[PDB]
């Protein structure tokens, strides 16, 4: 689990999102496993606005954060997991690590900020969902 608190917005997994996250949708993308919902109080989160691929990630299940070079956000086949099919993800960059299903949300920081979420693990990979393209959340 896990979110990121940016302005007046929470960017969360699509797949965790609440029933109160879709009550107050900004936007959701499937393909990207990503939703934004509306918040009342400011949050303390900063995105990164770069091309990084040096970072460091949070992961639940070793109660550690790991320093890890990531590919580029591109288009890619994702095996099946407990919360998808066999699937195609956009917007998705990986890196060798630890990640099982619970460690979605976790953060992956560089030094300009928020890089994005844990979205897939398995086969020694952590994916991680890219939020720096979505200008929108700095500003409204
Ligand atoms: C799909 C997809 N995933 O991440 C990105 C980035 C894209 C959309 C577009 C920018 C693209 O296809 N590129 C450059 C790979
Ligand atoms: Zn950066």
Redesign the pocket.
């Known amino acids: 689990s896990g979110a990121i608190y940016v302005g007046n917005y929470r960017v969360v997994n699509r797949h965790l999102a609440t029933h109160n996250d879709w009550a107050n949708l900004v936007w959701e993308d499937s393909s990207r496993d990503l939703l934004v919902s509306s918040t009342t109080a400011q949050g303390c989160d900063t995105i990164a606005r770069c091309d990084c691929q040096t970072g460091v990630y949070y992961c639940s299940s070793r109660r550690k954060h790991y320093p890890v070079s990531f590919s580029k956000?591109?288009?890619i086949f994702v095996e099946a997991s407990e919360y998808y099919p066999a699937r195609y993800q956009?917007?998705?960059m990986l890196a060798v690590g630890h990640s099982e299903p619970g460690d979605c949300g976790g953060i992956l920081r560089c030094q300009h900020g928020v890089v994005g979420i844990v979205s897939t693990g398995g086969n020694g990979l952590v994916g991680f969902a890219?939020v720096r393209?979505l200008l929108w959340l700095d500003e409204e």
Do not use: E
């Open positions: 956000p591109s288009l956009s917007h998705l890219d393209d």
